[PDB]
Amino acid sequence: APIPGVMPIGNYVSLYVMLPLGVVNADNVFPDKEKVEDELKQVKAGGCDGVMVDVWWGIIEAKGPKQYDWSAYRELFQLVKKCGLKIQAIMSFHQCGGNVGDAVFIPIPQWILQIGDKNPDIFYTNRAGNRNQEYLSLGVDNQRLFQGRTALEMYRDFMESFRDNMADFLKAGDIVDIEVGCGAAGELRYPSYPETQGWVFPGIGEFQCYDKYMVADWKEAVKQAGNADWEMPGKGAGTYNDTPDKTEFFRPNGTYKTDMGKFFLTWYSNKLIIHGDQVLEEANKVFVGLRVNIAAKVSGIHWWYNHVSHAAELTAGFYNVAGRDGYRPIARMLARHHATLNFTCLEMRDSEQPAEAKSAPQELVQQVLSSGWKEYIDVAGENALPRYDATAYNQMLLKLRPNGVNLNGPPKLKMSGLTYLRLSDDLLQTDNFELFKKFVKKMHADLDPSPNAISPAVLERSNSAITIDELMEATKGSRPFPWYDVTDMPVDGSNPFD
Amino acid sequence: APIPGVMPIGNYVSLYVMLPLGVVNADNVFPDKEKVEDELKQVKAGGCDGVMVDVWWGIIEAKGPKQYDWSAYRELFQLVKKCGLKIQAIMSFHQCGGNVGDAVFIPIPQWILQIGDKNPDIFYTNRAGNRNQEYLSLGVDNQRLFQGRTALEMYRDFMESFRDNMADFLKAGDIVDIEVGCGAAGELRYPSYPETQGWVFPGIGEFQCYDKYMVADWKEAVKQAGNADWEMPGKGAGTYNDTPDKTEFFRPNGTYKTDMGKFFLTWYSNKLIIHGDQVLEEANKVFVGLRVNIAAKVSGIHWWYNHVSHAAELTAGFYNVAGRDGYRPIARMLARHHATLNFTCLEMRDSEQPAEAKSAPQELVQQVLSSGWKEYIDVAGENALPRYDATAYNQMLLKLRPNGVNLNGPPKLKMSGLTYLRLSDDLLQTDNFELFKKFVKKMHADLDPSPNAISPAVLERSNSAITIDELMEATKGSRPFPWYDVTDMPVDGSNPFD
Amino acid sequence: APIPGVMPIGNYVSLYVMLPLGVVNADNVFPDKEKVEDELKQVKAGGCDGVMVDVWWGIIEAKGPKQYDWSAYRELFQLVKKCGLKIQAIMSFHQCGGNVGDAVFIPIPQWILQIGDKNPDIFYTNRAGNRNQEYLSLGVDNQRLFQGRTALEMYRDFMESFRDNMADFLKAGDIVDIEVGCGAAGELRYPSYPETQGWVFPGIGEFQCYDKYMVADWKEAVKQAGNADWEMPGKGAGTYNDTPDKTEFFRPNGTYKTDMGKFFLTWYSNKLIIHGDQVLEEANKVFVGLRVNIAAKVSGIHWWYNHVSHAAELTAGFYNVAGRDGYRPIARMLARHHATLNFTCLEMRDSEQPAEAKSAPQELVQQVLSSGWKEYIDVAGENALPRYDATAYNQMLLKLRPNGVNLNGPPKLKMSGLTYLRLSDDLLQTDNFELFKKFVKKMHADLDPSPNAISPAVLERSNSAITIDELMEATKGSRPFPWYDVTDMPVDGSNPFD
Amino acid sequence: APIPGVMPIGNYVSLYVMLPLGVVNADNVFPDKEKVEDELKQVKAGGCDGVMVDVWWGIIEAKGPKQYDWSAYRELFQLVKKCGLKIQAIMSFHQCGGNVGDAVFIPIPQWILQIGDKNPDIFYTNRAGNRNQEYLSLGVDNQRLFQGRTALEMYRDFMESFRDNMADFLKAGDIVDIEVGCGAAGELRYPSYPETQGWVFPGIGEFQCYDKYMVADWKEAVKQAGNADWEMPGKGAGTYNDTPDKTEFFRPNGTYKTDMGKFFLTWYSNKLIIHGDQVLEEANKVFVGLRVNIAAKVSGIHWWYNHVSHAAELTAGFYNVAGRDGYRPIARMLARHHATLNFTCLEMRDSEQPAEAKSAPQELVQQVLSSGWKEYIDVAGENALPRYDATAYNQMLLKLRPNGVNLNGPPKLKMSGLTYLRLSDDLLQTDNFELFKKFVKKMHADLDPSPNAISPAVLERSNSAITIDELMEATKGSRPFPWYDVTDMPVDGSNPFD
Numbered sequence A, B, C, D: 001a002p003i004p005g006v007m008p009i010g011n012y013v014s015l016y017v018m019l020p021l022g023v024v025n026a027d028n029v030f031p032d033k034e035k036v037e038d039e040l041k042q043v044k045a046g047g048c049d050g051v052m053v054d055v056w057w058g059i060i061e062a063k064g065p066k067q068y069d070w071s072a073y074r075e076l077f078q079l080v081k082k083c084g085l086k087i088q089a090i091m092s093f094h095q096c097g098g099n100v101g102d103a104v105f106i107p108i109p110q111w112i113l114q115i116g117d118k119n120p121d122i123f124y125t126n127r128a129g130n131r132n133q134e135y136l137s138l139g140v141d142n143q144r145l146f147q148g149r150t151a152l153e154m155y156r157d158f159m160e161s162f163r164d165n166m167a168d169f170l171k172a173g174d175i176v177d178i179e180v181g182c183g184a185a186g187e188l189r190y191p192s193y194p195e196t197q198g199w200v201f202p203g204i205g206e207f208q209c210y211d212k213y214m215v216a217d218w219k220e221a222v223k224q225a226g227n228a229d230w231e232m233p234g235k236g237a238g239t240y241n242d243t244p245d246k247t248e249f250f251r252p253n254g255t256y257k258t259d260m261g262k263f264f265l266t267w268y269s270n271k272l273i274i275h276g277d278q279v280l281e282e283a284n285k286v287f288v289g290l291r292v293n294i295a296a297k298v299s300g301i302h303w304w305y306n307h308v309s310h311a312a313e314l315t316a317g318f319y320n321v322a323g324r325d326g327y328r329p330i331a332r333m334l335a336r337h338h339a340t341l342n343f344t345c346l347e348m349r350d351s352e353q354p355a356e357a358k359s360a361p362q363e364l365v366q367q368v369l370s371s372g373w374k375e376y377i378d379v380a381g382e383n384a385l386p387r388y389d390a391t392a393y394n395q396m397l398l399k400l401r402p403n404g405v406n407l408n409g410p411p412k413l414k415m416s417g418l419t420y421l422r423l424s425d426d427l428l429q430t431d432n433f434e435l436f437k438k439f440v441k442k443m444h445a446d447l448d449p450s451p452n453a454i455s456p457a458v459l460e461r462s463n464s465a466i467t468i469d470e471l472m473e474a475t476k477g478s479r480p481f482p483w484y485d486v487t488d489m490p491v492d493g494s495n496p497f498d
Ligand SMILES: OC[C@H]1O[C@H](O[C@H]2[C@H](O)C[C@H](O)O[C@@H]2CO)[C@H](O)[C@@H](O)[C@@H]1O
Pocket: A185, A201, A299, A300, A301, A344, A345, A384, A385
């Protein structure tokens, strides 16, 4: 029996804060140095472990191919290191929305946008023929279209330039995570719910496989199956803001239940898995032998989860239906590269969602985290929308330790880390910043911060294993681990006794 | 993330087997040495960790006060030690039923039965005036009636004679547990459901506080409360085989809900707690500084648990009702002496009980184990009735690890050990003995036996703390820890995934 | 291979400081509270782990038998606990010199001195017939002469009164060591070099076995050997300030080499061992089951060590000669009670001693510590004379870790602790107190203090085993472990590389 | 204090046996499969941990550049894996003597010998102009002379072909060490004592830097120092079998003490260090992220060690003189690649060497192992000549743990492993094989074999750091750690007590 009052370190969970969006201007400039280093000081005073910042592709390689400028980000990291915080870098091969709302506009290298200018098919395309310019379609990962280099080669060269230019921070251990962007918002998914094309929650979304490079692939595949006459979904699949039932593809016993539907969804989902597999290999080769975690982000698509079609998840590329786990195979893939899974949604509660949405964020989180730990990989996460209430802090606290704390040692289930939405004035406001420091404490299980990177203490990155299209075994349905009902360590409460 | 296939030792749970009832004759004789040492060899071949044997008081101190004969038990232990098994000794200050059914008859020292012969009040008495001769009423713990010695002093002298005569086995570490008998069948309870007086499941039972020594105590207490005119229950409490509702004491809003009823139940239950407290102190003083666990046994009284009166538990001395945990204070008491709680019922399932019984064995087990771990003590257990089916083996397996195994280290919840009903021919039968060896393996979490006493590896016994009638704080209701639905490691099944 | 800059905790060695001699007046008064709590604050500011204080027998039981007053010592400990320091209590059953030099005079309970007044034989006596009143001769351990109680019983009752009155400090873990006094200055030895009787370094000393109770014992023993006509040493043994060679008992091939000499020395040394054995048993029984170390102090008698007679050691009671280890059997005895050996001399260097003295403090320390670790017990120590130079700090540092630090884990050889001479103004003087804080740091192996009682972290006291006059096996000569030449972590130096 | 009889695992040291020289014929054939698998079975029955085998370059790439055949070695490893032994593979880029003595003849790829046929300068050359064909001179590491590939590129391609073809054995963890050959006999040294050119112990040897590629380098370097007129040693340096004093270069106050001599030796020794640095980088890049140790072998050149010139060491390339550690910088270099140092000589005793030789093998071993552990790297080793006596087994046992065993945890100093000379009939002979099994037991510190690769349990290979010609700091003289006098665990003896 444990000694009363003794809380083992294994229960500690790192907590990082995301820095303001344009902390480094679209122009490679780092302004307001003084101010920023005052917020960082407060953040550190709150017991935070570190921060997560976007290393924008459209800024570093702005001037031209292979010519990178790390000057600013260098000052930014030295500043952070000076305040005693660890660093989570996101390799952002995407655009940071430049919509009316003014929020800083950071596209991808402009010279790339000029190539797609005469070759739209480099972007993800819906069936109407709209082109999304925030990320490069996977249909061109292995295509030589960018001044000699292929999409994948551009990704490695970037991470490689980053590895060599940040070697000192990496040696010292200041950089703890390398979050590899695999699509829009840096997430391994299709751009199925583009706000720029008229999407509004809770539309089902749209399939994004109509660029020419992807189509050809679909044609070759449909022929080797003996059904050369099969086509991709059409008006039957509907549009961005449709409902599953107003559709013929997602209605109960609809087209997705068909041999042809299963063949399409299998193809579309595998295509996304393979895109992830290939990007993470380059990431593995670039960081092997270093003490740092590599992670891919998987978005949480909870709307329509309680509908037989799991429509929203399907358009995004996750083939998750009854009797078919569409997440587990991703996790086995990530397992291959000894990578961590970062799930970007876990503060939400089923009741905070309109009934009309068929949303089930909690049940989603359980399945995803369960299939991750079942394939022996570390799972990390963050919140989706900004929040400063105790309700949100408690939900996140539940998910970091589904079975509460373990007084006998490391818990049975535990997330390796959580990154908080974003640092801001509304947060640093005396009031909020108070509740916050409480949440950070509960995150550390009432322990004091430990700059020794306890737990997630970066382990040496191992060389990848070897794949096989044997992921299909991974889709076997399974019972998710049982979740506690409420948090063990609430921010404004006492020991519920479980 | 853990390494696949690596099962940490912390998940291991010791499994012992109870030896045949009269393995040592009522006459201090150890017959059939040859046969027995062949069963022990099989038992050890099954991976069992050890065995539990009754060190009968009525055999060792048979000839007369202070004159003990450990000869036979000495041969028995040397034999066991030779077969490489650990030893769980029960200090049996009780009688082993000498009913018609022939099963060996072992009373308590006959010279004691001759004293109670002219002084019946030494035995537990019901209101009709029946005397139970299997154990000495707690009303005489501190009474000088036995040739100079008091009940408690007789208990310590016994354990003390046992400590000195078994010092070598204790030094070597062969004796791992000292199970201290506190009543009938060696359990801290009142003899409320005596089969010798006509009791048949699921009778509510009867209060056992009518001996003269206890009565006086009740009179003194009722007067200092200002209600000198209060009495103990009468015909209103009913008889052994009554139902809660046919009673006026246990009916909804019955007498037990009254100020007088609460005052009686509080008194009756505290009296049992104090009897335990005093017997375990003597046990502490006798074994301090030695590497061995001391444990008290608490019986599982599941019938009528789902009735507002918790009748059966009340007559046995456990004041467990809505908004009042009658087990937690016992556990805090046991915590004081760094003692382990042995719960004698945990293979049963709610469905194996007649609906008419209002029985809830599973919900009982949860509450008892939960309140034990909440007071920071080790909880151990055993099955109540003999069983050889996979259904029973799986239930016990669930309770030893309510949240399954922990691949990251010691589980969150885990029992320190389990002792199996009893070694017998029907068990050692090729068939059964097979299922059994499977159960032992799952008990060890598919690991190989570890004679190093892993986990429960006997720690040094610490001197007791100091009580206060501050147990009353312990009766505050609480949420029990959440239990998994099915076992993690079933005997004839695969990984349910939780 | 270890990680550079990582110093494992196992290399940490606790450092305590002795408080001023009369910190509690001969009159049970604790004056200058304010001042003292200012020194304690400085001491704690120096990183010290705790302090060691004399719990004088002549103060606590001054008024009369069994009537103890812990009032003052209670204030003293609460003050110390308030400054965050651990406590090493010495059960001082001796007198604290009340010589001309004024230094506070604290005798043993005056009522005892009045008994010896008519019975001088209670004190250790030399052959001239001088009586030493600082401690009770072992010849009366088992003699009922003190108002009903025996010497040993008076010792246990004292430690028992101390255990019950200090239970809270003991529970909390503030009291870490119980140093049990076994003679003059609290050391298991004979008062062979009494400064009160004219002794001046480096006299050989005198045997102290002439009180009547001891003599009788010697007569009974000499008769069962068949030499009833043997006598104790006479003028042949010389006097306090003689040299080994001017003697006939200690000259090469002198009387100590004889069958009669060996028989006397064997008897005299065993008598001291048994006195220790019996006092430590009482100490064991009183503190079993508690988290605290019990230790006996053995004085370092280095003069005449390099002479074949080891004269000084012989008169003190240590039968240490060529081919006979007179310390190892003491250590095996101490092993029996799971006790620690505190050696009171280990800062000295062979060169700081006059050549005429035949002194070998370093070689002594090696033998004593080696035989201690060989019998599996913890060895602790302190300096003999007050010192504030780097030479002394480095010697002590060598002996705490004879083989320096271990970057792979706990060192091979390591002392469990060291108590510094005594807190004083000449030490707290800005200058000295500086060198001191350096020494404390090196003691902790350049780590920061750890109030968690790391290493010596008080383990539960185990019940004693059982002796036999089989100590004689322990006198077999043996090679001491090899010692490093210089310290690993000097106060004013760098890594000598070993 | 440790528990008696408990030997911590950290004291365990792996023991491997070298397989017979041509276990795989010069013709890629694996004959006598049956016999061999019977010896392996005995070897495993002796508790050995594994075996070390030469993966000859002249066999695998015999047919032609880039065309490797791993067929045989594949059968050999599967056989070994079947017998439950770990594998130490030597990347042998050298020749295995094909002298008169018949012992199997295995040269390097014959097509390479045909190139050097018209270009002798690819081989190491002495001043008379003799060419050694057992290894490629470092003067051609970065020269494109081998059908497009450079020496270094040929080495990586080989290790890379080995990594990919042995991936399964590597994944499983059967291959534990990758011993990278850096010269003759696979050792980082110059071929200074070639038996093929008339060398006989204890000749001083000859400098091996006269090939044209090396000379040019020496000319460029001597000019930038402003002494363009300096030359390499001549007749003044003598010949293979000369004595240090009959020379003018190695005589006291000879040419090696001169500014010109120091400049030559500095250049010659650095050249060897850099050759090692470059070969180990390729090895690092090829094995990063895998759980396997990479090691370089440094030969033990003990003759003339006790002479001021350290002649033999100087000709071999180790600039080790008074006030200059010529080994430490090698170790700091090896530290850069997280590599292990394998010292090939450590059973010898100073007394087994002719006085005329000025040999000091023991003092050599101390310095080399000490400088290795001081630069934070693991040191391993083997014996130089075959031996089956207890004298030899005890010496090796001393060096594996210079300070014996540590009952408190991992020793202060400990070798990571030892590979035994070679499996043979004279060893497997009932007699010898007996003493042997004793030695293996003492190697494991009287523990039973642990196939879990305890201790050296292959850790993940980390990416290399980055060099600088800042090795020069490493040549600062230092005190080696102190060595125990005799072994802790002798094969035919008892506890010397240190
Ligand atoms: O962006 C607003 C969108 O946020 C949430 O959905 C997130 C998802 O949980 C994870 C990933 O970061 O992207 C999705 C959207 O980009 C809300 O659930 C949703 O209602 C809201 O419209």
